């Protein structure tokens, strides 16, 4: 409808796949090369389904900060025959607050879904499903099951991936440029 949704759409149309694990279907953001991200609770194994194609996982790393605290981001390298458009220059370098964010989802159930979630707070610490978690972004939208892995963007920045909610608020794990330096 506007430049927020324009940027979100441009990311969804070239940089997302549908990832299926034994724990469900997730929006998966492709970042560069054959490297993508997914919430750690997806429990990625040796094999994953990518747009319903059986795909070997070449590496999977559940990120933690240097206090050894969960970040809820898994970095996956896929044995795929095709590279993602490199979007690393749209990643923020530092932890920050944002205005006017969009949460975008693409699954079998929720195709082409875009939610204007508005103001995003650097919340920091969250007890997420019983696990102490750092670098959490918070937005005041009643997000539901099926939105995990959803991409959070502002105009010109890809700032996080949706990892949970409490019925009133939604929570995303930060994406930082330093996760994807090669």
PDB file of C-alpha atoms in Angstrom:
ATOM      1  CA  UNK A   1       0.000   0.000   0.000  1.00  0.00           C
ATOM      2  CA  UNK A   2       3.069   2.284   0.692  1.00  0.00           C
ATOM      3  CA  UNK A   3       6.942   2.216   0.769  1.00  0.00           C
ATOM      4  CA  UNK A   4       7.005   0.028   3.953  1.00  0.00           C
ATOM      5  CA  UNK A   5       5.064  -2.726   2.146  1.00  0.00           C
ATOM      6  CA  UNK A   6       7.053  -2.062  -1.092  1.00  0.00           C
ATOM      7  CA  UNK A   7      10.388  -2.902   0.642  1.00  0.00           C
ATOM      8  CA  UNK A   8       8.813  -5.901   2.499  1.00  0.00           C
ATOM      9  CA  UNK A   9       7.403  -7.251  -0.817  1.00  0.00           C
ATOM     10  CA  UNK A  10      10.843  -6.914  -2.568  1.00  0.00           C
ATOM     11  CA  UNK A  11      12.451  -9.018   0.237  1.00  0.00           C
ATOM     12  CA  UNK A  12       9.652 -11.662   0.267  1.00  0.00           C
ATOM     13  CA  UNK A  13       9.616 -12.170  -3.529  1.00  0.00           C
ATOM     14  CA  UNK A  14      13.379 -12.978  -3.905  1.00  0.00           C
ATOM     15  CA  UNK A  15      14.802 -13.800  -0.426  1.00  0.00           C
ATOM     16  CA  UNK A  16      12.279 -16.259   1.186  1.00  0.00           C
ATOM     17  CA  UNK A  17      11.586 -19.980   0.915  1.00  0.00           C
ATOM     18  CA  UNK A  18       9.167 -22.254   2.811  1.00  0.00           C
ATOM     19  CA  UNK A  19      11.237 -24.407   5.242  1.00  0.00           C
ATOM     20  CA  UNK A  20       9.640 -27.564   6.728  1.00  0.00           C
ATOM     21  CA  UNK A  21      11.183 -29.482   9.689  1.00  0.00           C
ATOM     22  CA  UNK A  22       9.536 -32.101  12.039  1.00  0.00           C
ATOM     23  CA  UNK A  23       8.363 -29.061  14.149  1.00  0.00           C
ATOM     24  CA  UNK A  24       6.365 -27.414  11.277  1.00  0.00           C
ATOM     25  CA  UNK A  25       6.436 -24.987   8.313  1.00  0.00           C
ATOM     26  CA  UNK A  26       8.437 -21.708   8.716  1.00  0.00           C
ATOM     27  CA  UNK A  27       9.147 -18.580   6.679  1.00  0.00           C
ATOM     28  CA  UNK A  28      12.941 -18.808   6.017  1.00  0.00           C
ATOM     29  CA  UNK A  29      14.976 -15.706   5.026  1.00  0.00           C
ATOM     30  CA  UNK A  30      17.829 -16.387   2.520  1.00  0.00           C
ATOM     31  CA  UNK A  31      20.663 -13.852   3.255  1.00  0.00           C
ATOM     32  CA  UNK A  32      23.440 -14.610   0.672  1.00  0.00           C
ATOM     33  CA  UNK A  33      24.989 -17.598  -1.178  1.00  0.00           C
ATOM     34  CA  UNK A  34      23.171 -20.735   0.178  1.00  0.00           C
ATOM     35  CA  UNK A  35      22.960 -19.266   3.751  1.00  0.00           C
ATOM     36  CA  UNK A  36      19.529 -18.698   5.392  1.00  0.00           C
ATOM     37  CA  UNK A  37      18.126 -18.138   8.926  1.00  0.00           C
ATOM     38  CA  UNK A  38      15.246 -19.811  10.868  1.00  0.00           C
ATOM     39  CA  UNK A  39      14.184 -19.730  14.549  1.00  0.00           C
ATOM     40  CA  UNK A  40      16.245 -22.233  16.622  1.00  0.00           C
ATOM     41  CA  UNK A  41      12.997 -23.927  17.923  1.00  0.00           C
ATOM     42  CA  UNK A  42      12.462 -25.220  14.280  1.00  0.00           C
ATOM     43  CA  UNK A  43      15.072 -27.870  15.394  1.00  0.00           C
ATOM     44  CA  UNK A  44      16.887 -28.117  12.017  1.00  0.00           C
ATOM     45  CA  UNK A  45      18.421 -31.581  11.331  1.00  0.00           C
ATOM     46  CA  UNK A  46      20.583 -33.222   8.586  1.00  0.00           C
ATOM     47  CA  UNK A  47      17.679 -32.922   6.076  1.00  0.00           C
ATOM     48  CA  UNK A  48      15.116 -30.115   5.642  1.00  0.00           C
ATOM     49  CA  UNK A  49      12.349 -29.484   3.037  1.00  0.00           C
ATOM     50  CA  UNK A  50      12.757 -26.257   1.005  1.00  0.00           C
ATOM     51  CA  UNK A  51       9.637 -25.355  -1.081  1.00  0.00           C
ATOM     52  CA  UNK A  52       8.720 -29.131  -0.691  1.00  0.00           C
ATOM     53  CA  UNK A  53      12.146 -30.340  -2.040  1.00  0.00           C
ATOM     54  CA  UNK A  54      14.274 -32.693   0.152  1.00  0.00           C
ATOM     55  CA  UNK A  55      17.492 -30.680   0.855  1.00  0.00           C
ATOM     56  CA  UNK A  56      20.684 -31.723   2.706  1.00  0.00           C
ATOM     57  CA  UNK A  57      21.756 -29.287   5.459  1.00  0.00           C
ATOM     58  CA  UNK A  58      25.524 -28.668   4.992  1.00  0.00           C
ATOM     59  CA  UNK A  59      25.816 -26.779   8.342  1.00  0.00           C
ATOM     60  CA  UNK A  60      23.481 -25.424  11.056  1.00  0.00           C
ATOM     61  CA  UNK A  61      24.626 -23.176  13.944  1.00  0.00           C
ATOM     62  CA  UNK A  62      22.337 -22.069  16.830  1.00  0.00           C
ATOM     63  CA  UNK A  63      23.708 -18.608  17.691  1.00  0.00           C
ATOM     64  CA  UNK A  64      24.397 -17.575  21.309  1.00  0.00           C
ATOM     65  CA  UNK A  65      25.863 -14.244  22.570  1.00  0.00           C
ATOM     66  CA  UNK A  66      29.233 -14.050  24.413  1.00  0.00           C
ATOM     67  CA  UNK A  67      27.427 -14.395  27.813  1.00  0.00           C
ATOM     68  CA  UNK A  68      26.449 -17.873  26.307  1.00  0.00           C
ATOM     69  CA  UNK A  69      22.730 -16.775  26.190  1.00  0.00           C
ATOM     70  CA  UNK A  70      20.319 -18.118  23.481  1.00  0.00           C
ATOM     71  CA  UNK A  71      19.704 -15.685  20.534  1.00  0.00           C
ATOM     72  CA  UNK A  72      16.963 -17.957  18.933  1.00  0.00           C
ATOM     73  CA  UNK A  73      18.604 -17.624  15.442  1.00  0.00           C
ATOM     74  CA  UNK A  74      19.920 -20.696  13.581  1.00  0.00           C
ATOM     75  CA  UNK A  75      22.145 -20.061  10.525  1.00  0.00           C
ATOM     76  CA  UNK A  76      21.661 -22.815   7.944  1.00  0.00           C
ATOM     77  CA  UNK A  77      23.776 -23.569   4.885  1.00  0.00           C
ATOM     78  CA  UNK A  78      21.625 -25.441   2.296  1.00  0.00           C
ATOM     79  CA  UNK A  79      22.798 -27.941  -0.381  1.00  0.00           C
ATOM     80  CA  UNK A  80      20.753 -25.988  -2.970  1.00  0.00           C
ATOM     81  CA  UNK A  81      21.600 -25.533  -6.719  1.00  0.00           C
ATOM     82  CA  UNK A  82      20.892 -21.754  -6.621  1.00  0.00           C
ATOM     83  CA  UNK A  83      22.165 -18.694  -4.617  1.00  0.00           C
ATOM     84  CA  UNK A  84      20.035 -16.046  -2.847  1.00  0.00           C
ATOM     85  CA  UNK A  85      20.350 -12.404  -3.854  1.00  0.00           C
ATOM     86  CA  UNK A  86      22.921 -10.951  -1.385  1.00  0.00           C
ATOM     87  CA  UNK A  87      20.882  -8.717   1.055  1.00  0.00           C
ATOM     88  CA  UNK A  88      23.600  -8.342   3.740  1.00  0.00           C
ATOM     89  CA  UNK A  89      23.847  -4.534   3.083  1.00  0.00           C
ATOM     90  CA  UNK A  90      20.190  -4.202   4.368  1.00  0.00           C
ATOM     91  CA  UNK A  91      21.156  -5.647   7.810  1.00  0.00           C
ATOM     92  CA  UNK A  92      21.685  -3.204  10.729  1.00  0.00           C
ATOM     93  CA  UNK A  93      25.154  -3.105  12.355  1.00  0.00           C
ATOM     94  CA  UNK A  94      23.951  -2.236  15.934  1.00  0.00           C
ATOM     95  CA  UNK A  95      21.056  -3.026  18.354  1.00  0.00           C
ATOM     96  CA  UNK A  96      18.353  -0.333  17.889  1.00  0.00           C
ATOM     97  CA  UNK A  97      14.690   0.725  18.160  1.00  0.00           C
ATOM     98  CA  UNK A  98      12.675   1.269  14.881  1.00  0.00           C
ATOM     99  CA  UNK A  99       9.465   2.978  13.709  1.00  0.00           C
ATOM    100  CA  UNK A 100       6.887   1.691  11.192  1.00  0.00           C
ATOM    101  CA  UNK A 101       7.935  -2.018  10.872  1.00  0.00           C
ATOM    102  CA  UNK A 102       6.193  -4.667   8.684  1.00  0.00           C
ATOM    103  CA  UNK A 103       6.120  -8.376   9.590  1.00  0.00           C
ATOM    104  CA  UNK A 104       5.865 -10.498   6.371  1.00  0.00           C
ATOM    105  CA  UNK A 105       4.973 -14.255   6.258  1.00  0.00           C
ATOM    106  CA  UNK A 106       4.832 -16.737   3.411  1.00  0.00           C
ATOM    107  CA  UNK A 107       3.648 -20.331   4.187  1.00  0.00           C
ATOM    108  CA  UNK A 108       1.260 -22.893   2.549  1.00  0.00           C
ATOM    109  CA  UNK A 109      -1.393 -21.626   5.099  1.00  0.00           C
ATOM    110  CA  UNK A 110      -0.509 -17.840   5.079  1.00  0.00           C
ATOM    111  CA  UNK A 111       0.700 -16.855   1.540  1.00  0.00           C
ATOM    112  CA  UNK A 112       1.589 -13.166   0.740  1.00  0.00           C
ATOM    113  CA  UNK A 113       0.774 -12.000   4.344  1.00  0.00           C
ATOM    114  CA  UNK A 114       1.985  -8.485   5.401  1.00  0.00           C
ATOM    115  CA  UNK A 115       1.251  -7.016   8.897  1.00  0.00           C
ATOM    116  CA  UNK A 116       2.012  -3.375   9.777  1.00  0.00           C
ATOM    117  CA  UNK A 117       3.190  -3.874  13.406  1.00  0.00           C
ATOM    118  CA  UNK A 118       4.287  -0.222  13.926  1.00  0.00           C
ATOM    119  CA  UNK A 119       6.816   0.818  16.613  1.00  0.00           C
ATOM    120  CA  UNK A 120       9.559  -1.748  17.495  1.00  0.00           C
ATOM    121  CA  UNK A 121      11.350  -1.615  20.922  1.00  0.00           C
ATOM    122  CA  UNK A 122      14.843  -3.014  21.661  1.00  0.00           C
ATOM    123  CA  UNK A 123      13.343  -5.129  24.502  1.00  0.00           C
ATOM    124  CA  UNK A 124      16.573  -7.098  25.180  1.00  0.00           C
ATOM    125  CA  UNK A 125      16.047  -9.908  27.711  1.00  0.00           C
ATOM    126  CA  UNK A 126      13.027 -12.230  27.365  1.00  0.00           C
ATOM    127  CA  UNK A 127      12.192 -15.585  28.948  1.00  0.00           C
ATOM    128  CA  UNK A 128      11.010 -17.147  25.630  1.00  0.00           C
ATOM    129  CA  UNK A 129       9.236 -20.550  26.007  1.00  0.00           C
ATOM    130  CA  UNK A 130      11.208 -20.999  29.302  1.00  0.00           C
ATOM    131  CA  UNK A 131      14.670 -20.100  27.769  1.00  0.00           C
ATOM    132  CA  UNK A 132      16.537 -16.870  28.724  1.00  0.00           C
ATOM    133  CA  UNK A 133      16.948 -15.060  25.352  1.00  0.00           C
ATOM    134  CA  UNK A 134      18.828 -11.823  24.421  1.00  0.00           C
ATOM    135  CA  UNK A 135      18.559  -9.212  21.585  1.00  0.00           C
ATOM    136  CA  UNK A 136      14.689  -9.433  21.436  1.00  0.00           C
ATOM    137  CA  UNK A 137      12.689  -6.805  19.487  1.00  0.00           C
ATOM    138  CA  UNK A 138       9.074  -6.223  20.716  1.00  0.00           C
ATOM    139  CA  UNK A 139       6.012  -4.961  18.766  1.00  0.00           C
ATOM    140  CA  UNK A 140       2.427  -4.386  19.965  1.00  0.00           C
ATOM    141  CA  UNK A 141       0.574  -6.788  17.619  1.00  0.00           C
ATOM    142  CA  UNK A 142      -1.347  -9.983  18.588  1.00  0.00           C
ATOM    143  CA  UNK A 143       0.754 -12.347  16.367  1.00  0.00           C
ATOM    144  CA  UNK A 144      -0.346 -16.073  16.158  1.00  0.00           C
ATOM    145  CA  UNK A 145       1.012 -19.591  15.453  1.00  0.00           C
ATOM    146  CA  UNK A 146       2.227 -19.845  11.795  1.00  0.00           C
ATOM    147  CA  UNK A 147       4.089 -16.455  11.831  1.00  0.00           C
ATOM    148  CA  UNK A 148       7.446 -17.811  13.228  1.00  0.00           C
ATOM    149  CA  UNK A 149      10.388 -17.026  10.874  1.00  0.00           C
ATOM    150  CA  UNK A 150       8.361 -14.072   9.517  1.00  0.00           C
ATOM    151  CA  UNK A 151      10.612 -11.272   8.363  1.00  0.00           C
ATOM    152  CA  UNK A 152      10.581  -7.895  10.177  1.00  0.00           C
ATOM    153  CA  UNK A 153      11.584  -4.961   7.913  1.00  0.00           C
ATOM    154  CA  UNK A 154      11.532  -1.159   7.859  1.00  0.00           C
ATOM    155  CA  UNK A 155      11.996   0.844   4.626  1.00  0.00           C
ATOM    156  CA  UNK A 156      15.550  -0.121   3.630  1.00  0.00           C
ATOM    157  CA  UNK A 157      16.406  -2.465   6.602  1.00  0.00           C
ATOM    158  CA  UNK A 158      15.847  -6.197   7.402  1.00  0.00           C
ATOM    159  CA  UNK A 159      15.954  -6.049  11.239  1.00  0.00           C
ATOM    160  CA  UNK A 160      14.750  -9.444  12.614  1.00  0.00           C
ATOM    161  CA  UNK A 161      12.812 -12.744  12.372  1.00  0.00           C
ATOM    162  CA  UNK A 162       9.583 -13.391  14.370  1.00  0.00           C
ATOM    163  CA  UNK A 163      10.173 -16.004  17.156  1.00  0.00           C
ATOM    164  CA  UNK A 164       7.138 -15.734  19.533  1.00  0.00           C
ATOM    165  CA  UNK A 165       4.330 -13.790  21.231  1.00  0.00           C
ATOM    166  CA  UNK A 166       2.125 -13.612  24.385  1.00  0.00           C
ATOM    167  CA  UNK A 167      -1.239 -12.954  22.611  1.00  0.00           C
ATOM    168  CA  UNK A 168      -0.804  -9.096  22.985  1.00  0.00           C
ATOM    169  CA  UNK A 169       2.845  -8.567  21.853  1.00  0.00           C
ATOM    170  CA  UNK A 170       5.099 -10.188  19.212  1.00  0.00           C
ATOM    171  CA  UNK A 171       8.842 -10.825  19.593  1.00  0.00           C
ATOM    172  CA  UNK A 172      11.630 -11.015  16.987  1.00  0.00           C
ATOM    173  CA  UNK A 173      15.313 -12.047  17.232  1.00  0.00           C
ATOM    174  CA  UNK A 174      17.626  -9.259  15.914  1.00  0.00           C
ATOM    175  CA  UNK A 175      19.499  -9.742  12.645  1.00  0.00           C
ATOM    176  CA  UNK A 176      22.951  -8.044  12.728  1.00  0.00           C
ATOM    177  CA  UNK A 177      25.432  -7.627   9.805  1.00  0.00           C
ATOM    178  CA  UNK A 178      28.172  -9.281  11.991  1.00  0.00           C
ATOM    179  CA  UNK A 179      26.276 -12.648  12.009  1.00  0.00           C
ATOM    180  CA  UNK A 180      26.963 -13.054   8.214  1.00  0.00           C
ATOM    181  CA  UNK A 181      30.575 -11.819   7.693  1.00  0.00           C
ATOM    182  CA  UNK A 182      32.439 -14.448   5.541  1.00  0.00           C
TER     183      UNK A 182
END
